[PDB]
Amino acid sequence: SVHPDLRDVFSKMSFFDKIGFLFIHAFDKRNLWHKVPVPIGLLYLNTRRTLLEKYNLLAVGRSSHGALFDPKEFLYRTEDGKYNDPHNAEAGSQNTFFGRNMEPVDQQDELMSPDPFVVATKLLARREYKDTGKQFNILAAAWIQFMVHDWMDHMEDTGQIGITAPKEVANECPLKSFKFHPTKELPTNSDGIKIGHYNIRTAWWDGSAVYGNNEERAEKLRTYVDGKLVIGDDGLLLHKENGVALSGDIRNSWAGVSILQALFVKEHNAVCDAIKEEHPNLSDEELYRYAKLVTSAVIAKVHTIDWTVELLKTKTMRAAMRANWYGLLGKKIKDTFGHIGGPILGGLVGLKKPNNHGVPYSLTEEFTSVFRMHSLIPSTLKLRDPTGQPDANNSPPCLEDIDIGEMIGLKGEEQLSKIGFEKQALSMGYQACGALELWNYPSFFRNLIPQNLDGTNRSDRIDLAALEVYRDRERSVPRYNEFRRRLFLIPIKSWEDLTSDKDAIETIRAIYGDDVEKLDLLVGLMAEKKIKGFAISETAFNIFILMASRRLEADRFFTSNFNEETYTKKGMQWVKTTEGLRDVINRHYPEITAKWMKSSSAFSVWDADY
């Protein structure tokens, strides 16, 4: 039968949705979807995706009456993300509402319940350091922040509020209190959801972390010759006199992200060289437009079939992510004959029309919440010598341990300037990142300098762990158990359902009591027992089934305009022949690649034996 908490929604479903639900629920009740052979696993995922697309896409703000335009007149990715969706010129652009995956839950009377500092101190603060083994390295951790920089940032109110640590835990808090800005609340003037928040980044997967979020930023980064972007002679980003990096989105960053931005600047410039060689007479503007299309597609491809495949290290997930990109008919057929069939057989990429499933494209409040993965950052970075004698392990030899707190923000840019690209990248490649588990949140995040929009330092330092828990509540995102119910997942009845870590359970009970409905989303996501091979929780993964597919399927430039006319022949060939981050690093840094990158993926610890 059907879980009691899901009986109501089940009874209201259409016959076809009832069938899909009973199929997935049969596996879920026995925790079986990830324990079956690949074909049944894929059917499960596709079925779950179809249900999420129907029940978990909610508009924020009025949907009708988008600004009028012809897509044939906009065959490029605009500086602010406008003019993608023919029916909604503003969809995916800078300064638009975050959508929702679920109806908001008002928590305005419980923003401090339980206390954010108590949560941060007792449940999140790093104790014994936990890492991912060989599965996922520090480049993988930098990569995902690099994507967040592409995707999402919430507009802030101009006023300030503050939180003070209670006496029970103050002695263990690096900060005793801190100030920050509330999330800006805007009226939707719509019949549905009444209050929304604005995304100040472009929600389209458009390489905006490299290119900028609007025309005013984008102009600052260009050489205006041959379509190219500015880069230093050391292969690192240039800096303004105030110490801020010249790149697309540089706010609240660190050295690991800066090297990826520099790498993709070189990628963009190399694409410019290649296209100009085939088409000698293109202007700077035309070359920039084509190269941005190519580089943003390379980024989406590397993320989809390389980064995600190492994050979710199972057979079913490698097949699923490759199917989203290439289709179930596979790369050879896709590359030779183009897109065949629908989203399953031919993939999301190269669909003849974009598909938003009836709801204007946006990234969502919940997508923000499940991407809060600050525990991926290790406490220290082991620097290695790119030209050292291979050690006892045949690794490059160790040079010194550096506190990763010294590699963050403006001071991090200074330290990176003394270390250089090769040493930073090699060192990050050879070290595991942190695991997404409880008690694994870096101490330097507990007394962090946050930045203004323009990248400059704020004087009010923050306890990020405490602030994150506060933000989810402030933004009306359902807490862990309700969040699961809204995704058609079986809720916990007791703490034992969540994890078998006895120490975790005892600490959770001391803070939340026996009220499973009180458990914060972030705490639940970190605590949840993980599927073998999964670096993330199943709960987070469910938001991603829907939203990662949506980033590709809703975008004209991954679908109707993913072709030679739009990208150029050479541009399309560049995307088609690039399979992962290894290919990009090999292009610009073949020496450290040949000497030290032994793993097939550049996201594995580089001496992994696969």
Ligand X SMILES: CCCCCCCCCCCCCCCC(=O)O
Ligand Y SMILES: CCCCCCCCO[C@@H]1O[C@H](CO)[C@@H](O)[C@H](O)[C@H]1O
- Residues tagged active-site: 149
Residue range at the interface with Cl ion (CB under 5 A); choices 4-12, 37-45, 184-192, 574-582: 574-582
Say if CB 520 and CB 480 are below 8 A apart. yes
Check binding of 208 to Ca ion (CB under 5 A).
Answer: yes
Which residues lie near ligand HEM (CB under 6 A)? 141, 144-145, 148, 152-154, 180, 252, 254, 368, 371-374, 376-377, 408, 450, 464, 467, 471
β-sheet bridge partners, residue 312: 534
**Cβ-count burial of 206 within 10 angstroms (0-12 exposed, 13-18 middle, 19+ buried)?**
buried
Check binding of 549 to ligand X (CB under 6 A).
Answer: yes
Residue 226, sorted as left (phi over 0), alpha (psi -120 to 50) or beta, turns out to be: left
What is the Rg, in whole angstroms, of the alpha carbon atoms belonging to the chain?
23
Contacting residue, 112, 333, 344, 399, with ligand Y by CB under 6 A: 344
d(C-alpha 279, C-alpha 567), whole Å: 12
Least Cβ distance, residue 401 to ligand X (angstroms)? 31
d(C-alpha 213, C-alpha 218), whole Å: 7
Check binding of 554 to ligand X (CB under 6 A).
Answer: no
Interior angle at CA 213, CA 211 and CA 217, nearest 5: 70
Contacting residue, 165, 175, 323, 489, with ligand X by CB under 6 A: 323
450: partner contacted, choices Ca ion, ligand Y, ligand HEM, none (Cβ within 5-8 A by kind): ligand HEM
99 contact partners, CB below 8 Å, separation of at least 6? 57, 58, 59, 60, 359, 360, 362, 363, 364, 365
Question: Of the two residues 236 and 328, which places its CB atom closer to ligand X in the complex?
Answer: 328
57: partner contacted, choices ligand Y, ligand X, ligand HEM, none (Cβ within 5-8 A by kind): none
Question: Of the two residues 208 and 369, which places its CB atom closer to Ca ion in the complex?
Answer: 208
566 is in an annotated binding site: no
26 contact partners, CB below 8 Å, separation of at least 6? 32
Least Cβ distance, residue 200 to Cl ion (angstroms)? 31
Check binding of 50 to ligand Y (CB under 6 A).
Answer: yes
d(C-alpha 29, C-alpha 555), whole Å: 35
Contacting residue, 21, 34, 45, 519, with ligand X by CB under 6 A: 45
475 is in an annotated binding site: yes
d(C-alpha 147, C-alpha 139), whole Å: 12
Least Cβ distance, residue 318 to ligand X (angstroms)? 11
Sign of CA dihedral 507, 511, 514, 519: negative
Question: Of the two residues 16 and 224, which places its CB atom closer to ligand Y in the complex?
Answer: 16
Which strand (E) or helix (H) includes residue 268? helix 255-278
Q: Which residues bind ligand X (CB under 6 A)?
A: 39, 42, 45-46, 49, 308, 311, 320, 323-324, 328, 341-345, 544-545, 547-549
Can you give the binding site for ligand Y, defined by CB under 6 A?
16, 19-20, 23, 43, 46-47, 50, 342-344
- Residues belonging to the binding site for hexadecanoate are 303, 591
Query: Which amino acids are annotated as binding site for heme b, given as ranges?
Result: 154, 374, 471, 475
